[PDB]
Structure 1
């Protein structure tokens, strides 16, 4: 009672929408989702509270392993929980956590003078001051943390945590106690319009279309030209060239209101069948969306702003004296079960094999694929997507035959399934099949494609769908998936077209984890304080000097409310990272337009690893930066899987709200511009500006350490050269290129990509060529090693080109201005040269790299 009320108020606060607003809609679809998903999520919670302690570690602290894992001597520091005493010992990189734990237990038994009761099977290793653990049958070098410690030269710091301490964690965090006979053409009545705004010199026209995804089910139909006014009256029948029996389940009726002398005013879409498969009848008031002509990919829910929105009043006629439902799967299978099998020649079989292993088709090739659909199922099951595109979705008998084959179709690889989630495959059985083939995704693969799967939610026609249930069950079984599902949904609550669906998904999730809701509320409280702090800085910076604005910012941070809200939270960029004590004296802001905040933290328990920073940005849209950074991280994963480590810096970037988000601070790094300022009285002051970077690296890496710093520079430079080329990242200058003290180079501020439209050439800078060449004019041994790294990295990506295309195609749903149409994805097809052999593509890359070298020489000549 009292606790249910508190939880409801806490969910309302967290999701940024009062739960009463869901009830105020008196919508049965909203109500059924809330009830079904509350039940499904609470069952997930009860399953969790009973997990074994190692399974609970898999839930809460999923393993962070090196892509390769999916000899060498090592020093490790181990302490036991609650002890100020630690033990430093030598293990091998090939040793398993259990060997290290048994070594720590022998040390404790000798130091505490007792033959211990505890066995190493009773413990897990926590990374000090982090929500990260090392457990399982994996050598130590396979863990991201150990791998990171080895490369940086730092000593791993671990805590032996007993099964009883993990079980106390689990307990503390528990939840509190018949259509086919209807042959008449499809038709509607266009009654009237309301709240219409347009030039009175013009006329109003309503264009109407019937769609199955992106494809027209028949020709579009227009109303008559009526004079422009606030309340236009049509009262006319619009008839389509499609029988009511041929309407597919996922048929959408799309509208566009416009003014003619073309002038787009608004658009609205609706599904012809409801969420309970009933064919819609009666009057419908369609609260239209402003047009930026038909928009089939647009949401099928009305504009919530009923006070200002233009509205179309339509009538769906009563086609039968009884409710008509879409036929059940059993009746569809019955109809599709019958149909002649393909009996063709070996030559016509060779023409079919040529096109199925090939990508648009000619009409005769379509009729052949459809004829040979049984052979597609039995010998080319990965060509399901081609066959689905040749199916005539506007003929219920052809759809029945396709659906019969699909229900016996073998499970497809993850790559094929991601393609099948595209809006070009709108059928709910195709969608269900795609999800079934994605269930085999590992948590690491799911995490990698989470952003795209969340965007796919904007294509969903109904609230209760297989994709939401899949995403919810996977989020409730893995805290890190849960974390990022919440934030991707939360960051779009200011968008009216998704606020309902997203708010309901977050409510359902919260029912499944009360503790995690409170952890996320703490993150929201910090973000709330950061926004108020940033507004103060924006105002102050325009009136006083930077050291004055910085002092006032510190004073505001020093307030009890800010110190409490800003300290002891999980990072929204990484729930493994704990943001403990805010280091006020170290906090600052950037001189740029939006004045982003630089917030520093420290943790005594994590030591050096607890020294972390976050950038809070308000005023810019960070979605494209996040997508680019995720794509670079995917490149890094793919290269490491072929044994190529290009020493990339895929730092965190997370939109959290309306033009609001966080960026991970990469410590011990500076921009090329600051280094190239060539300031006097510094360790890097150069005779020639070209020496500055190398002198800076020399000062950070004394003696023998320079060699490895030049090598890290070369590797990351090859990785970023390929990544910016493939992704079309332009506007690259000295202030958006950074360098780490280790020698690693990385890119920041990714506002423009995919050539944005001017095709971006491969980029080579003489300042970077100089470091690669170890400060020598001619050093083709070092330069050509660099070109080899570029070529190897490029050819690895091309081999996974389809994965990038499928993910970028899913991202079209994001609404990013630079990722709107097929032209934007043409850029990625061209940069990866996928319509070529590896020989023709490598030849082409060599032409572009040599062209970039000749361009770079225009700077070398001087």
Structure 2
């Protein structure tokens, strides 16, 4: 009775009927669903018995300042079921417990009674948010308390008792031998079906065996056969590699095309199956349309069988042959010769492991494999790349050393997740080194780890199991894992994989399924409302379309679907009462909607907005914003706060997503229109930005507003330089009423292919110099902020390179080659010393200042 309801709710949420999984009749698919349902149900049961503070860590994980991983402060505290409140002055050095004990002493006098309840029995909720303050941390270490200190504002907190937290826990419960086959590997290319090509040309089928990116042997080609719907070959394609040497993760890649170079289609398959057995019999390869051989592409067929070209191939029977077990492998690898040559050979080893290498260096690194294991364990990735994956004796010797390799730092593990390391044991070892990842680090890299699933050869994998277990133990990780997979359900290549992961997650959290369905319902109404706006705007004037939008939002179905929800941009932010009168849309092509919200419980923190966008792909905006946010995190860990504005951006479906509204901000273009009869009207357009800051920050407040601008300007000058974000104009640069500058519209990065120089804009130099023509004291403090920021990022150059390497899996047009990653290597000057990189940065900066002065001359 309940299972039918749950299965139908899951189908609605994931945007794919669960019947379609059963209809495929695939054992791998069914075994993933049964095994992952059990694993996710175990996590759910574990959770229901968690202690009330452990339930807070699951649902409301702490939001701390990067540096946390004296001064007076006025706090307002109320109790859960109360109307009255208490305002008291505490210190930024005090912990929540002291503030809770202070709230209980203020309440004991108000209610004339010695209280039984101790501070230890409570937690402090941020008013109107899914956010809590708890644990041994001083108040200023929390992100909510710190943001309140900058904005001037007073924190509003609520004392929630343990019994009420336990009641939430309960309300949210889930309802009640291969090595003896030395023959050569070969296949039979039988025929092709539904093929479309120019009849003047001839069809060719190119095939190659790969272990990730490297070929296990040279490619082979079919005999040229005349173009037609059903081409027929019936021929053996013999590859030079023994069937016994085929590594476990070997994949046979296909490419059909026409020749006189006209690509048609590609398809890949794993030579071994998910249960480790060698593949035999006939296989029908439903091909993917091209734009030659594509190894990184999926190893599963195009689900569109009614229109896809299908290559028919035969995998011959070499004898049921499974891949040897790890004990057989470790026995074979247990025998070898160790490294034993002079300190002059070890000097060459030490030089090449601390600096792409020549063939004699590969023979040196492999010979000294035992010494790299014990004296340079972090060089595992170099050694794995020199390993001959096309010789089974060499794979067993490598796996023997890997099986007792010490756990590596997170930075090294993020490299091992790359597609250039397709061995399952290597991936398993990499995941083992990532378990020590804090929920905050995991969240930071969650987008990349989701893309790595696209490289996975099989459905059931250590990465999937790891991502699902971290999602079920932290509701914020769960929320974003769901949205990263949900937003890709319109992509045929990942819909099966992602749909199965979301169904499994849903088995672990039935309550959270209902929470996300409530978000999905709101996004449906937003698509329909946006569609109406697009239509109405091409016929009537903006005021008339805005009121028609408001009339549509005012219907019961819209008011119910759009209110009282968790923000998909941030589960801590509750979107309560939609303020229809404040809602509007922009005039650009896709007419993005601005939906305004408010909450009487939250006060000023409940006044939030979201932007629904349908028509543009938001993946790259998100990635760029996340990179900027990573920068701000890294700068803050070195004590450098550059007043960044990392607003949320989240794709949610096909060319659909949400952007977070940053209120009290306008574009440079709108400020520079120099409207008549304003608090900012100027004698010279050069003054407009500075007059606008003066109007927003009167008297003594201007000084701090100018410093906010300088700091954020320095951060964005460096961030856009490093990331090669060009096409910067006055309409994609915004400024906050506090002085903070930020960037929007990230359609182009990594120089995509010009080399984006450092940009210094005169208008911003004029604000930095406080309105003065010459102000070296203010200008050079800004060049210092730029230099500190640049030099802190270079020290993390490998973290950006590893993260961007994992991102090549996303299929982003401006992030699909070594040329794109090369761009960051140049911008961060990673091939140089710090002194040399700083001189090059100064020369880039001085060139930007000279360019800025071509506008200052006129």
TM range (shorter): over 0.9
TM-score between both structures, scaled by the size of structure 2: 1.00
**Deviation string for 1:474-533 (max 9, x for gaps)?**
000000000000000000000000000000000000000000000000000000000000
Q: Secondary structure, in 3 states, of the residue corresponding to 1:577?
A: strand
Q: Give, in whole Å, the separation in 2 of the partners of 1:336 and 1:780.
A: 66
**Correspondence for 2:153:** 154
- Where in structure 1 are there 5+ consecutive unaligned residues? none
**Correspondence for 1:789:** 785
Q: Give, in whole Å, the separation in 2 of the partners of 1:184 and 1:293.
A: 28
Q: Report deviation, 1:82.
A: 1.0
**Correspondence for 2:756:** 760
Displacement over 6 Å in runs of 4+:
none
Q: Secondary structure, in 3 states, of the residue corresponding to 2:454?
A: coil
Q: Report deviation, 1:289.
A: 0.1
Q: Give, in whole Å, the separation in 1 of the partners of 2:203 and 2:300.
A: 23
CA RMSD, aligned part only?
0.3
Q: Give, in whole Å, the separation in 1 of the partners of 2:397 and 2:528.
A: 60
Q: Report deviation, 1:297.
A: 0.1
**Deviation string for 1:567-613 (max 9, x for gaps)?**
00000000000000000000000000000000000000000000000
Q: Give, in whole Å, the separation in 1 of the partners of 2:279 and 2:658.
A: 45
- Where in structure 2 are there 5+ consecutive unaligned residues? none
**Deviation string for 1:132-177 (max 9, x for gaps)?**
0000000000000000000000000000000000000000000000
Q: Give, in whole Å, the separation in 2 of the partners of 1:69 and 1:182.
A: 58
Q: Secondary structure, in 3 states, of the residue corresponding to 1:178?
A: coil
**Deviation string for 1:30-79 (max 9, x for gaps)?**
00000000000000000000000000000000000000000111000000
Q: Choose the corresponding residue for 1:335, options 329, 332, 335.
A: 332
Q: Give, in whole Å, the separation in 2 of the partners of 1:648 and 1:363.
A: 47
**Deviation string for 1:813-850 (max 9, x for gaps)?**
00000001000111000000000000110000000000
Aligned residues between the structures: 858
Q: Secondary structure, in 3 states, of the residue corresponding to 2:341?
A: coil
Q: Report deviation, 1:233.
A: 0.3
Q: Secondary structure, in 3 states, of the residue corresponding to 2:824?
A: helix
Q: Report deviation, 1:467.
A: 0.1
**Correspondence for 2:352:** 355
**Correspondence for 1:846:** 842
Q: Give, in whole Å, the separation in 1 of the partners of 2:72 and 2:335.
A: 68
Q: Secondary structure, in 3 states, of the residue corresponding to 1:245?
A: coil
Q: Give, in whole Å, the separation in 2 of the partners of 1:465 and 1:344.
A: 41
Q: Report deviation, 1:335.
A: 0.3
Q: Report deviation, 1:449.
A: 0.1
Q: Give, in whole Å, the separation in 1 of the partners of 2:143 and 2:604.
A: 17
**Deviation string for 1:267-303 (max 9, x for gaps)?**
0000000000000000000000000100000000000
Q: Report deviation, 1:375.
A: 0.3
Q: Secondary structure, in 3 states, of the residue corresponding to 2:504?
A: helix
Q: Give, in whole Å, the separation in 2 of the partners of 1:630 and 1:456.
A: 17
Q: Give, in whole Å, the separation in 2 of the partners of 1:806 and 1:800.
A: 10
**Deviation string for 1:336-379 (max 9, x for gaps)?**
00001000111110110000111x00000010000000000000
Q: Give, in whole Å, the separation in 2 of the partners of 1:678 and 1:209.
A: 64
Q: Report deviation, 1:762.
A: 0.3
**Deviation string for 1:401-449 (max 9, x for gaps)?**
0000000000000000000000000000000000000000000000000
Q: Secondary structure, in 3 states, of the residue corresponding to 1:331?
A: helix
**Correspondence for 2:827:** 831
Q: Secondary structure, in 3 states, of the residue corresponding to 1:774?
A: coil
**Correspondence for 2:141:** 142
**Correspondence for 2:49:** 50
**Deviation string for 1:196-238 (max 9, x for gaps)?**
0000000000000000000000000000000000000000000
Q: Give, in whole Å, the separation in 1 of the partners of 2:246 and 2:652.
A: 41
Q: Give, in whole Å, the separation in 2 of the partners of 1:756 and 1:180.
A: 48
Q: Give, in whole Å, the separation in 1 of the partners of 2:70 and 2:718.
A: 32
Q: Give, in whole Å, the separation in 2 of the partners of 1:830 and 1:357.
A: 19
Q: Give, in whole Å, the separation in 2 of the partners of 1:717 and 1:357.
A: 36
Q: Report deviation, 1:756.
A: 1.2
Q: Secondary structure, in 3 states, of the residue corresponding to 1:179?
A: coil
**Correspondence for 2:115:** 116
Q: Secondary structure, in 3 states, of the residue corresponding to 1:76?
A: strand
Q: Give, in whole Å, the separation in 1 of the partners of 2:215 and 2:599.
A: 59
Q: Secondary structure, in 3 states, of the residue corresponding to 1:246?
A: coil
**Deviation string for 1:77-118 (max 9, x for gaps)?**
000001010000010000000000000000010000000010
